[PDB]
C-alpha cells in the first residue's frame, strides 16, 4: 500500500495502487485507494482498508452535510481541521491496530494564483497536519521509496501528464521495492488508480492512459 501526491503547474495529481494483503497473503488486487471527496479535493488513505473506507465515507458525508446546511462548502482550513479532528478521534482505535493514514490533495479555489492553487496536506498519526510546500507527498508502506524516487523525478513534473507519469513511475518503484505495495498487473491488466484535480475540479484518470504510461515506463526499465 502506497499513496502518492504531487502538484503540477495549475493543479495537483494524486494516485493509489490496487493491492491489499493480510500480512504475507495477498487479498485484493483491484483496491481503489483514492476517494474524490468533493470536486476540488481527493483523499487517499493508507492503513486499515475498512477504517479507510469508513473515514472516506464519514468525511464526504460531513463535507456534504455542512455545505447543504450552510449553503456554502467548508474552506480548505476548515476541511483540514475536520480531518485532523477525526484523526485525533481515532487515536484510541488506532493503538489496537485499526490505523489509517490520510493523504489530502486539494485545489484551493480561493488561492490567489490558480497555478499554485493545488494543495498537498500531510497528516500524522497524532492528528497533526502539514501542507507539503516542497511539492509532493507519499503515504503507505512504500511511501519512503516513492518519496525518494520522485524526489529525483520532480525536476520532470511540468503538467498533468508529466506529474502523472512521475507518480506512476514512483508507484512502480514502491511496488518493486516493497512487497506490500502493488504495481501494474499486466496479466490481469490491473493498474494503480489516479485522480487529477485542477481549476475545473477533480477528475479520474482513464485506465487507458494509466496502462499506457505504465507500459512505457516498463519498456524504459526493460
Amino acid at each position: 500500500t502506497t499513496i502518492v501526491a504531487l502538484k503540477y503547474p495549475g493543479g495537483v495529481v494524486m494516485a493509489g495502487d490496487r493491492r491489499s494483503t493480510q500480512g504475507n497473503m495477498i487479498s485484493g488486487r483491484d483496491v481503489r485507494k483514492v476517494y474524490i471527496t468533493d470536486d476540488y479535493t481527493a483523499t487517499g488513505i493508507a492503513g486499515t482498508a475498512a477504517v479507510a473506507v469508513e473515514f472516506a465515507r464519514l468525511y464526504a458525508v460531513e463535507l456534504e452535510h455542512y455545505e447543504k446546511l450552510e449553503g456554502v462548502p467548508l474552506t480548505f482550513a476548515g476541511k483540514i481541521n475536520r480531518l485532523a479532528i477525526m484523526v485525533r478521534g481515532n487515536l484510541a482505535a488506532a493503538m489496537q491496530g485499526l490505523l489509517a493514514l490520510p493523504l489530502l490533495a486539494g485545489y484551493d479555489i480561493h488561492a490567489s494564483d490558480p497555478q499554485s492553487a493545488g494543495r498537498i496536506v500531510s497528516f500524522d498519526a497524532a492528528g497533526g497536519w502539514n501542507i507539503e510546500e516542497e511539492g509532493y507527498q507519499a503515504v503507505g508502506s512504500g511511501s519512503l521509496f516513492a518519496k525518494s524516487s520522485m524526489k529525483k523525478l520532480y525536476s520532470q513534473v511540468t503538467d498533468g501528464d508529466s506529474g502523472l507519469r512521475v507518480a506512476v513511475e514512483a508507484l512502480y518503484d514502491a511496488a518493486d521495492d516493497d512487497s506490500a505495495t502493488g504495481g501494474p498487473d499486466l496479466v490481469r491488466g490491473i493498474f494503480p488508480t489516479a485522480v487529477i484535480i485542477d481549476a475545473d475540479g477533480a477528475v479520474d484518470v482513464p485506465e487507458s492512459r494509466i496502462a499506457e504510461l505504465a507500459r512505457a515506463i516498463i519498456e524504459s526499465r526493460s
Partner: protein
C-alpha cells in the same frame, strides 16, 4: 371547547400562510424547476435535501428553515445508515408529515409553513418527477404536474393549469412560470432546478446572469 382551539390554531396557520410569498415547482423536460419570489439575497426558500431531492416551502422562515435542517440531518442519517440510493422523497415527506402533525398537536403555536417535496429520476434513469406537498396539519398531497405555494395561490394556479406544458423546455417553462406568477424581474427572484441529467446531485440554482439571459 377543544374544537374552538383546533380551528383557531388551523386558521392562525392559514392566515400565516396567506401572508407568504408565492413559490412554484413544476415538472419540466429536465426535471423539476423551482421558482420563488425572494427579494432577499441572504434568505433562501429553495434548497437541496438529497442528491435528487430538493426543498421548497413558504411561511415562517425560521420554521421551515429548522424543518429543512432537521430533514437534512434525517436524510444524511438515512443515506449513511444504509446507502445513498436508499434515500427516497417518500420517506422524507412521511417524516415531515409526522413531525408537522406532531408540532400542530403539541406545540403551543402551529407552524405557518407548508412544505413541498420534489424527487426526480436518478442519473441514467427514467422516472416521472414526484411532487409531495405537505400541509401544516400533515395533509400531504402528491402533485403530478405542479405545486402552487403561498399567498393567493388561486390565480397563479389557474394560470399554471391553463398554461402547463408537460416536459416544457426550461426556457419556455420559466417564461410560463413567470407569466403565471406575475398574476417579476430577474432580481428579487430565486430559481433552482432538480436536474435529472446530473450524475449525482440533481439540484442546482440558476440566478443572475444565467437567469437574466434566460429571461
Amino acid at each position: 371547547s377543544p374544537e374552538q382551539a383546533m380551528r383557531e390554531r388551523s386558521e392562525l396557520a392559514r392566515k400565516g400562510i396567506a401572508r407568504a410569498k408565492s413559490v412554484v415547482a413544476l415538472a419540466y423536460a429536465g426535471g423539476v424547476l423551482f421558482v420563488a419570489e425572494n427579494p432577499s439575497r441572504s434568505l433562501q426558500k429553495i434548497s437541496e435535501l438529497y442528491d435528487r431531492v430538493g426543498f421548497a416551502a413558504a411561511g415562517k422562515f425560521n420554521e421551515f428553515d429548522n424543518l429543512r435542517r432537521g430533514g437534512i440531518q434525517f436524510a444524511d442519517t438515512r443515506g449513511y445508515a444504509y446507502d445513498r440510493r436508499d434515500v427516497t422523497g417518500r420517506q422524507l415527506a412521511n417524516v415531515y408529515a409526522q413531525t408537522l402533525g406532531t408540532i400542530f398537536t403539541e406545540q403551543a403555536k402551529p407552524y405557518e409553513v407548508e412544505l413541498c417535496v420534489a424527487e426526480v429520476a436518478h442519473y441514467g434513469e427514467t422516472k416521472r418527477p414526484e411532487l409531495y406537498r405537505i400541509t401544516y396539519d400533515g395533509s400531504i398531497a402528491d402533485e403530478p404536474h405542479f405545486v402552487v405555494m403561498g399567498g393567493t395561490t388561486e390565480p397563479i394556479a389557474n394560470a399554471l393549469k391553463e398554461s402547463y406544458a408537460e416536459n416544457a423546455s426550461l426556457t419556455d417553462a420559466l417564461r410560463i412560470a413567470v407569466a403565471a406568477l406575475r398574476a417579476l424581474g430577474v432580481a428579487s427572484l430565486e430559481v433552482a432546478v432538480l436536474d435529472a441529467n446530473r450524475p449525482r446531485r440533481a439540484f442546482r440554482r440558476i440566478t443572475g446572469s444565467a437567469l437574466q439571459a434566460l429571461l
